[PDB]
Write a protein that binds this ligand. Structure first.
Ligand SMILES: [Mg+2]
Ligand SMILES: [Mg+2]
Ligand SMILES: [Mg+2]
Ligand SMILES: [Mg+2]
Ligand SMILES: [Mg+2]
Ligand SMILES: [Mg+2]
Ligand SMILES: [Mg+2]
Ligand SMILES: [Mg+2]
Ligand SMILES: [Mg+2]
Ligand SMILES: [Mg+2]
Ligand SMILES: [Mg+2]
Ligand SMILES: [Mg+2]
Ligand SMILES: [Mg+2]
Ligand SMILES: [Mg+2]
Ligand SMILES: [Mg+2]
Ligand SMILES: [Mg+2]
Ligand SMILES: [Mg+2]
Ligand SMILES: [Mg+2]
Ligand SMILES: [Mg+2]
Ligand SMILES: [Mg+2]
Ligand SMILES: [Mg+2]
Ligand SMILES: [Mg+2]
Ligand SMILES: [Mg+2]
Lengths: 117, 152, 55
RNA sequence: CUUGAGUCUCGUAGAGGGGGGUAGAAUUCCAGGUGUAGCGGUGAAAUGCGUAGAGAUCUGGAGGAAUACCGGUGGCGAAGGCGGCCCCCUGGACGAAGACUGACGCUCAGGUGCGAAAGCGUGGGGAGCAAACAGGAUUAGAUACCCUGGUAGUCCACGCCGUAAACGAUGUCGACUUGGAGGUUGUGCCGGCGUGGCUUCCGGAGCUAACGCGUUAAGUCGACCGCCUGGGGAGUACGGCCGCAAGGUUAAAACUCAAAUGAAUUGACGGGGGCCCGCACAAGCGGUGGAGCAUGUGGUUUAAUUCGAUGCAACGCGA
RNA sequence: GCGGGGUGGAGCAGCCUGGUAGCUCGUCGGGCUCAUAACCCGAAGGUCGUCGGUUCAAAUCCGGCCCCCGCAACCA
RNA sequence: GCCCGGAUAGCUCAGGGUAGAGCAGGGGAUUGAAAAUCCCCGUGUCCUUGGUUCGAUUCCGAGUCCGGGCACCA
RNA sequence: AAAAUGUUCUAA
RNA sequence: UGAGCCUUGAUGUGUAGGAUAGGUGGGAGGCUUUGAAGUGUGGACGCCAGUCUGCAUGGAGCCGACCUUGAAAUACCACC
């Protein structure tokens, strides 16, 4: 509906999947797309390409809204951690402030036991 | 091989057209080491194609060939027990050889009377993107584009 | 790793600066080290092994 | 008597200990806003969450636990151990000058105290993690590894337990015996010259079965203590003491074997690491396995179906 | 006295609803392997406890007998 | 008996102007087998009939069967 | 990713 | 914030075609400088084929029936 032109991209990129959501500067989500929904499942859900595809099909999800000043707020140690920004730029968004908001505990809670593979 | 000292082998051109590509075609269609029979079959099929196409006797062959060449192949690579088939580009000589082999094996998998008729039909059908060799090209392209994520 | 793109700064070098900043801040190293719990004896042994190898 | 031991004076560093308070990040939950079809997980999946609106993003709130960076083969402590910041109480160590007591020392069976984690009792607390447990996979099976959850427990107060590869596998105290490179703490004189404490690596003599140790000795000695006497049986049984219990501690014998063992050497092997090669893969072409026949073999049969070869490297082999 | 059952070598379906005998393991033959197990590809294997009857046709439906599981056996 | 629903493929379900969306099955591909995923293929009077307009499942009429609610249930 | 085993004595 | 009602403004591109045309219609001329074919800007919908546009500049045109549709052009105009 209402154009915004000053949104923000949240890229939750983990080791298994990439979730990219274009929201407003108030945090209100406008659109979202995942590597698992772009058309990938399994070893392909976690490929830097899948995150690129998810970002490029999330960009065209938010077309009725504003486009001018998307900014990236990537989070998580995902394989699709920079290809998402590539796709966002290729879609036609100028990135003003690109930042990392990965949650780092300052100690925090005990992590799960290590996998014995 | 490990040494990788292989070079290139010169193939004498086709006597009737002076083309190394058509010589390679005659040579691929060979069975049990018979240059003369394969050459006769290729010549007859090309004459039929030229008569029914009106382009040329070598340009029409290249037109049919262009519509069946693959622009990308896929090479297997196991990672964790499962396969990770990675797409790779195909060198021009390899894509020529692949298209030519596909055309020959598609012509062999037909039901016409003689091999010359089978091959002429196959090239005519490939020039229109309707033969089974073109179907194999399309399947290879689609399956190499499906797992494009692995093309690092 | 908060960086604002400079006035008329090209995009590619901007996220090159972003990658350099996050590498300097060690975000990915911290996340990798916090994925699983390392027993204190294991952490001490790893530190000792790193010290011995470096020396 | 002062040189061992200790006291006093000033100063220094330190995750040394006990108590109280507080801060930020993060994980969980609760509510509310936006938003839509997947999240999550794996080697791949599925269980599990999700159209009752999840995941994602933003706002407010609750609670528990641990303190990223600093951070360092750094520091402190007898050992176990100790890591945000602040305050209160408190132990020890070290240094520079002196003054003081004047052998007041060292070790120590029994004794006493401290003593990781797990565990136990009572009362709280419970975010995350996670024995037991359930489910999904994997597998021939999988009472496991992997995944999804998850209770004791992990946290606090008090009281038990008193064991660990509680290890430097090296008891404590004192003296003596070439060096090198550091780290961390004081200190004098004048950026250098000296001087103490603790600590890391290398290495000389010497020692050791060797590996190695080597002024922080496993070198040369002295004092005292603990401990060993082949491998199993067995740190077990019985008895004693201790414990709420789990169990701890002290601790045999019959029987049985001719070994068990430590270090190092040469090979071999590794689902250890490298650097290479081979129709070994990859790229291709043609076959075998199907049919009929030939031939050899096994088996069966026969009076005999001669004997031998019989993984690769026997089977159109001796022939 | 009442109910259920008997089907390849083993354990279970097919019986209600007469014409259509299946699943897993096991066995045999060939593969992989230095061999065995696992695994892979093929095959054989039960005329249905027995007898009688109906029906064109019975494992099936109905009766007798045999064997085996249960259930019941109470008031004195 | 009335009211509310329908009848679409080997199977589950949409949609006056097109017969389709997916799942099974076969095949190609990788691959030791099983995989996920990739690609190709079909599976119809859209229950029968009558009116409709330039045709009809699509608007309606008469029925058959397949599910709920209610009523008589002596 | 899964990948179990190798009768007794003798070692020429 | 639905539900229902009354009115306005357009919506409903089988198949032809100039035409994002369902039926019906008094009936085939109004509109126009009471600033008009050509417009820049802005908005609505769109299976994006084609319609509406607030105003500017611009200047005064636009033109129905006639031909391929099963139907006829919103030139004036009425009921779903
Ligand atoms: Mg995990
Ligand atoms: Mg110390
Ligand atoms: Mg004692
Ligand atoms: Mg404890
Ligand atoms: Mg309790
Ligand atoms: Mg289980
Ligand atoms: Mg678990
Ligand atoms: Mg407790
Ligand atoms: Mg002990
Ligand atoms: Mg000891
Ligand atoms: Mg040394
Ligand atoms: Mg010694
Ligand atoms: Mg003994
Ligand atoms: Mg005991
Ligand atoms: Mg006892
Ligand atoms: Mg040894
Ligand atoms: Mg090969
Ligand atoms: Mg044969
Ligand atoms: Mg013989
Ligand atoms: Mg002999
Ligand atoms: Mg067999
Ligand atoms: Mg073995
Ligand atoms: Mg053995």
């Amino acid at each position: 509906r209402k154009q915004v032109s000053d949104g923000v991209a949240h890229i939750h990129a983990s080791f298994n999947n990439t979730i990219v959501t274009i929201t407003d500067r108030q945090g209100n989500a406008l659109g979202w797309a995942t590597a698992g929904g772009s058309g990938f499942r399994g070893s392909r859900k976690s490929t830097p390409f899948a995150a690129q595809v998810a970002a490029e099909r999330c960009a065209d999800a938010v077309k009725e809204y504003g486009i001018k000043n998307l900014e990236v707020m990537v989070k998580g140690p995902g394989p699709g951690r920079e290809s998402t920004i590539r796709a966002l730029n290729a879609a036609g968004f100028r990135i003003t402030n690109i930042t990392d908001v990965t949650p780092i505990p300052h100690x925090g809670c005990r992590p799960p036991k290590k996998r014995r593979v | 091989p490990r040494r990788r000292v292989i070079g290139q082998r010169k193939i004498l051109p086709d006597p009737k057209f002076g083309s190394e590509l058509l010589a390679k075609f005659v040579n691929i269609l060979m069975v049990d080491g018979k240059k003369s029979t394969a050459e006769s079959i290729v010549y007859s099929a090309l004459e039929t194609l030229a008569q029914r196409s009106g382009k040329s006797e070598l340009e029409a062959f290249e037109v049919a060939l262009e519509n069946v060449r693959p622009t990308v192949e896929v090479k297997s690579r196991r990672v964790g027990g499962s396969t990770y088939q990675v797409p790779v580009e195909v060198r021009p000589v390899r894509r020529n050889a692949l298209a030519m082999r596909w055309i020959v094996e598609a012509a062999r998998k037909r039901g016409d009377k003689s091999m010359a008729l089978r091959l002429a039909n196959e090239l005519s059908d490939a020039a229109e993107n309707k033969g089974t060799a073109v179907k194999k090209r399309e399947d290879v392209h689609r399956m190499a584009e499906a797992n494009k994520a692995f093309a690092h | 790793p908060v960086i604002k793109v400079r006035e008329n700064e090209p995009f590619d070098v901007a996220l090159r600066r972003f990658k350099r900043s996050c590498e300097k801040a060690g975000v990915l190293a911290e996340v990798r080290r916090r994925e699983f719990y390392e027993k204190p004896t294991t952490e001490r042994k790893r530190a000792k092994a790193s010290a011995v190898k470096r020396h």
